[PDB]
Ligand binder design. Sequence first.
Ligand code: FES
Ligand code: FES
Ligand code: FES
Ligand code: FE2
Lengths: 180, 180, 180, 416, 416, 416
Amino acid sequence: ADVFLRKPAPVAPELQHEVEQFYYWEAKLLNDRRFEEWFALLAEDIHYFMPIRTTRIMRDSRLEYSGSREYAHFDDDATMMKGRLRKITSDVSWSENPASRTRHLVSNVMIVGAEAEGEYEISSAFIVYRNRLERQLDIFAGERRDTLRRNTSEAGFEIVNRTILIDQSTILANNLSFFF
Amino acid sequence: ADVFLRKPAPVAPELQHEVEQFYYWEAKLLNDRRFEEWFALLAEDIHYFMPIRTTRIMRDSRLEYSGSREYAHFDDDATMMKGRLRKITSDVSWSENPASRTRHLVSNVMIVGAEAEGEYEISSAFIVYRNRLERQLDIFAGERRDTLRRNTSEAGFEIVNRTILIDQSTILANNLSFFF
Amino acid sequence: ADVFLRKPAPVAPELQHEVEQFYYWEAKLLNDRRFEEWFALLAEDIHYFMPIRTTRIMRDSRLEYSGSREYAHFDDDATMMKGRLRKITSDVSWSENPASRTRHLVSNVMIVGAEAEGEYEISSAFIVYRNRLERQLDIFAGERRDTLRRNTSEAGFEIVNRTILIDQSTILANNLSFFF
Amino acid sequence: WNTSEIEALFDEHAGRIDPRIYTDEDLYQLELERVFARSWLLLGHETQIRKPGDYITTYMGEDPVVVVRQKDASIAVFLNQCRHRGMRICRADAGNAKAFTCSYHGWAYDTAGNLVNVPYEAESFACLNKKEWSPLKARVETYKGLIFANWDENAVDLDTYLGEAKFYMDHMLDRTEAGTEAIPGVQKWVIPCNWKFAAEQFCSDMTSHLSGILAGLPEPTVGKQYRASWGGHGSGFYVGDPNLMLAIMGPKVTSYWTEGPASEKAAERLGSVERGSKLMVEHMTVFPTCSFLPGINTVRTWHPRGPNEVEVWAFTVVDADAPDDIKEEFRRQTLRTFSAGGVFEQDDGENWVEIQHILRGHKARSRPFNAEMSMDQTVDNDPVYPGRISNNVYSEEAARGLYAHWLRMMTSPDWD
Amino acid sequence: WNTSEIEALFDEHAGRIDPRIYTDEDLYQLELERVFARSWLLLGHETQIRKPGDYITTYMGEDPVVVVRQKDASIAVFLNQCRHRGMRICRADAGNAKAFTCSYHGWAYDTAGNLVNVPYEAESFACLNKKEWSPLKARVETYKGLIFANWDENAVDLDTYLGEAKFYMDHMLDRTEAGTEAIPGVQKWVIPCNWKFAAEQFCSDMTSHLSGILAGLPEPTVGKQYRASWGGHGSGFYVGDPNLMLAIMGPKVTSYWTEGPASEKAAERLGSVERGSKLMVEHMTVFPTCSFLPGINTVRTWHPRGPNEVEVWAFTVVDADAPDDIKEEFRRQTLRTFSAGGVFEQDDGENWVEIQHILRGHKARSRPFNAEMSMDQTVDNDPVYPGRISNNVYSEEAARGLYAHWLRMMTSPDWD
Amino acid sequence: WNTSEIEALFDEHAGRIDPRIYTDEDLYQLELERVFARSWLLLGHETQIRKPGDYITTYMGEDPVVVVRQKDASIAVFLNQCRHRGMRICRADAGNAKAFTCSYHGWAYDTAGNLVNVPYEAESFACLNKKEWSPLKARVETYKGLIFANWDENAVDLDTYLGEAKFYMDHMLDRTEAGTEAIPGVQKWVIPCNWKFAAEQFCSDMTSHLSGILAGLPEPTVGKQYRASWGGHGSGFYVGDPNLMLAIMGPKVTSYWTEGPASEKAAERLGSVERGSKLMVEHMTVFPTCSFLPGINTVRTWHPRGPNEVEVWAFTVVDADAPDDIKEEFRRQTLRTFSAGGVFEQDDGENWVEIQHILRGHKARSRPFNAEMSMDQTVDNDPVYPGRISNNVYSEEAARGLYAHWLRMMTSPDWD
Ligand code: FES
Ligand code: FES
Ligand code: FES
Ligand SMILES: [Fe+2]
């Protein structure tokens, strides 16, 4: 990890709550399809990362995740994201695709501070539950490792770094249209 | 939503805990089959609601949920519930049906106050895990939107309103015999 | 139960956090394959228990779990565990088996004190998500009933009793190589 | 398979059902071809598509169909599949539409699924036949609210098909000048068991389901059963008492059903006291997959999946002029009892699942099931009721008739 | 398929297994008909149903059976299926019962699954045959604790079937005057792979599984293997040393097994030192799906699902008079090693799953597997051991015998 | 099935595809035997295994293969199955290996999957044939980076097979002296639909996918299509403009592709302006399951599962000498658009799933699909482009050729 070779700890608890509540909200936006409002949470230096994972022999666990010059599931700029938001908004306006039902269960949130006032480093757990059109269902779990920054918005924070560690070799659904 | 167009916030944290602990308990009763004790949590004006959800075209997301004069999965009186409790107790006494294994994972609990002392409004997340007889398994997720009322019981609260927003088009199990 | 016929309550909240954070950490170790460090959490009188569960007729719910002189999924000494840790470490060193991807979602944590300073009694919820080699996936849920003891380590606690109440009749995966 | 040994699967005179009919894969494909693709299936109710251009998507067999109200208020039912590469044309469960466009490659359709536009047929398709290349259309026909379809351009008329079954359907559908509206919203669940079990069945103690009953009380009956002459339909009901009142629908919905203006009058379009007001609960099954309970008023289609799975699409119907709060009762009580959550129907489901599961076994599939209950107890002339009426209601006569028509459908290439 | 080409699936003299036997769907249905429906299957242990009226539910093949202790302490085994519409009769895993009622429609049964009461056979069934309409019954027979059943009224006797296999079963089951009790509770898991792989197998290095061993130590061996004359059984064991002691069962369970009173005496009912105390670990497989490890003392049935999946039902047996804490050891050590969580058996599972997965492929299914290990190394007269004994224990002779009986079962319509 | 009626499944002159080709189980098993087991399949790129002993595991059809760099830097491709009991030999997705040992029973292999050691063949196997008992090997051949294999020792050479298709592959693979390296990491997802749909297809508006486009802009075109003479390949591209620039790959990756040194020079190994720099987006499909988009530069294999499911293994390739940040762009833009998360390819998936789902239905499977788009619009001599070129790019000519070769493969026992 770095930051998590050693146990957090302890903070808060006003802080603990404040973070958890941020995530619960973020999940509400995501699950309620309230996407305009969600993107607004990303810091303009957002780096939104989800490496491809490989099944490896136990001594080579090390080599599991794709590193930073290699292919990912997601590796997005603020600019690239802005652009996905355009895809979402554009489907809503002129298009006949069906809407998609999600749930984000947020959990094992651990908080350590960083340099700057300001900025906190997070580990959380996962389950995303996606049902859509009649019977399709996929369940995904994993770890979000985020960098959060304090912020004068009603939301209170902005996501500067997100690293999504899926518990998934081959991707078990048929697309990754939602957002962790 | 109403109540959730805007971020809670902030409370508590004695309060946050007090609510979460209520839910954790409620789940314990539900999963431990301790049903007599659970119904006892419902306010006599309990309205226990789970609308049918529809796959809709993205601009018509709006039309997803069945409204209040239309068919639901659940739309129960105190009286109707009293009556389901009779079904459960009656199966236990004289009947050869098998017992059913549940888990209720409770999570993204957000709390806003209402009018009256007294009464709080809640958003939480979901996963219910139901295994029964050898190999049957269904997993359900979603949102409970509850109205809770303070109360002189050892439980501390009573459920006056429950609205269960399933992440499920067609119901993916074969019955809905448990309780969210 | 004993301890849970009646609602906790209330503690903490510094305490509530302190326990939850213990579990979140424990999960981090487990999911990160950081096993050496995990076993180190078990008290030398650890009793690590997971009874076999049976589908029973509703009046006989009572008879669900295997009692203590009967066969379990798990019934381990400190010594037996020490020994499983040897199996894990040994596979890592000289062996070609693949590594296994887990997530432990921890949740409905309820805390009551016991006799001794010192020692706390816990109920928590579950979902474990196990993906491995390409497409295999099992999802398990249930209740951990733990006895925790205060401790001078950086971890702060040690697990003296763990009782794992699976929501599973027949075991739905093909092995139980991980640890709840 | 083979004409001869398909026939050996069901012995009518002597009540044997061969359990393989419920499990066999190729047998299933034949039902799909010789039952569903040739009989009248339940798509829903008129009320679910009032305005022009309103659609709802459902199934005939395992073919998804779009069901659309037209400008002349006709009902168009076309196969929900673009003929180019078979993309889905309509994609929501329900909604309103000016036209339909196939998302994959542009092919545009009108309200009744006619391929009206391909982009640049200039450039390509040196004369494309629009009519030919529209989806398959299905004969639509309506019975007093209920929407029905049938692919077979040679199938008999719907009224003929129904035969004297119309009589018993009138018990729910025609008991008021103003017809009947379907309360909006259709519950759907999955139930891994053969469609015939559901249809045959369900709830056939026409002896428990006990706790369900004890739910609606706040603490050996008379009746008859009808078996259709022709097409494997059948109904079963009571005469005077609780059960409907207490238990299933409660106080109000039974006052309404049995006494007072709405029941006496109106209900005397049926030209029979008792036929209108001394009725109580009633079964009814319109071959192959249409089922409803006049008095309770859930209607279902059963949709086939495996030979091993079925989906249950159910709504509720009320008399269109019934008082507000009486309509409301129908809504609550129906869902309380005969929904997937219902205090009755939650058990019917649990059952059939086991039934199917067992038949995974060699020995479970090798001796017949008993369906000889109450044989030769029908006269076929009753003063009041048409068809073939049993006078003790505890029989499997309607059921035998179901399997018997099934057998006729399965063994014809042509119409008998 | 066809008598002739079923036979080509396994070449005995020359060790070829055709991988399709593990995957083929129709082949599977034949096993179900010609192996399971005609051979003696393991239902459990007597101890799991002491008192009259105690039942436990299990499987013969893919038929669910109820297993019930009667008033005369006999053991009744009937097909867990009501003959009316095939609802499940007994619904828990285990319990005690005065009688059995079919939840769906009332049909009531006695303790040995005889249809004794239908409600109102007055009203209906103008004389119903109760006997005919009871579930199918299965021949039950017991071997020194182990409960066995077989549907075929013509199958040979159980002792005959077993033949000289009884000898090797005696190594676990008859080493004390007082017989053997099964520690209560049966672990069950699912393992998507053909049942034959499990049975053949398992753990057949009779060269790793290494880490499992290194678990029980706190830091090239002598032995023989037996192949049955008739019915495809077979066993493999050692002679003197660690492995049992260190490693699998530990200190106490080996003192008990090898030295001291309980092992010398008692164990000398076997009439042979070494046969009683210089034994160590032992395989043993009783065709088709019965497997146990005398010395460790897990017993399993393997239950077939697909040709592609199997369930593993395993318990543990101890000598009924063994000291408290020695029984206790058996309990802990067994589950520590040969459970689904076990430090050994957790790997056997991982394996077979891959084996089956691969055979999804065309090329993986097109050339035979090698089973020619250690051919013609049997004399059939050993001073001590009956049957057909190999003297180097690292052979696939028992295995060849397994596939060979399979072949005999699969190609007979009658009994050879 | 049968030589004659397999042929009736696809009418070429007249554009009918019979939808059963996409769904039928036995048909599927024949593809596996007569398409995949006899044609050249895409295992990946050289770069994914530079150093000796580097492996990666993939699929030819539904056979898992190990792909290993040897000491003489050759590429060995052997069936990932131990011949003893069919355990998996290589178990990670990727890595480096001195040798290979089968975990189940010790059998040891070398870097190119030759069974080199069995423990104690002393004791047993009175002379075992090591060569015979090694896994099946596959003919390996390389095209300018792309690794290919084919089981059939009689298949034509890879260059022959490819025929004049090499030309269009050169558009991505040979546009620089230094060849092309594959950016490391291979995305994999599952998409329940027939492999042919993916291959045929994908994204065939060679009219929406609109929102995807609108993503890359910060607010009726000229081109041709090629159909292979022999082996069912085919490609489709544009000439001058946005689309590539704006929209898919953005500013930099198009400057690079169209103007400046790297595109003019280097790209003039192709001996044609336009062929090098006035190109824009391009389809390309190398029968049966190899697909890539020169200009965008995702490559995929499609791996068959059901007739009803496919897996998508996709990576990205860049010119091996391209500037750092230009390589970087290729990385980001590719994944932004043509990954499973991609703003384009996330929709292609949603589609095909519905297509397959529908065909669960009897009627959906009973009339053909239309593939008559733009017939007889090919001359077969173009000044510049080899093979059979259409001059309006909006046609299903390449597609027809795909199904036509499929038909040839499916109906030969020998090579035509
Ligand atoms: S399938 Fe091509 S137009 Fe719809
Ligand atoms: S199936 Fe009807 S009595 Fe049990
Ligand atoms: S299968 Fe036995 S050596 Fe690998
Ligand atoms: Fe908290």
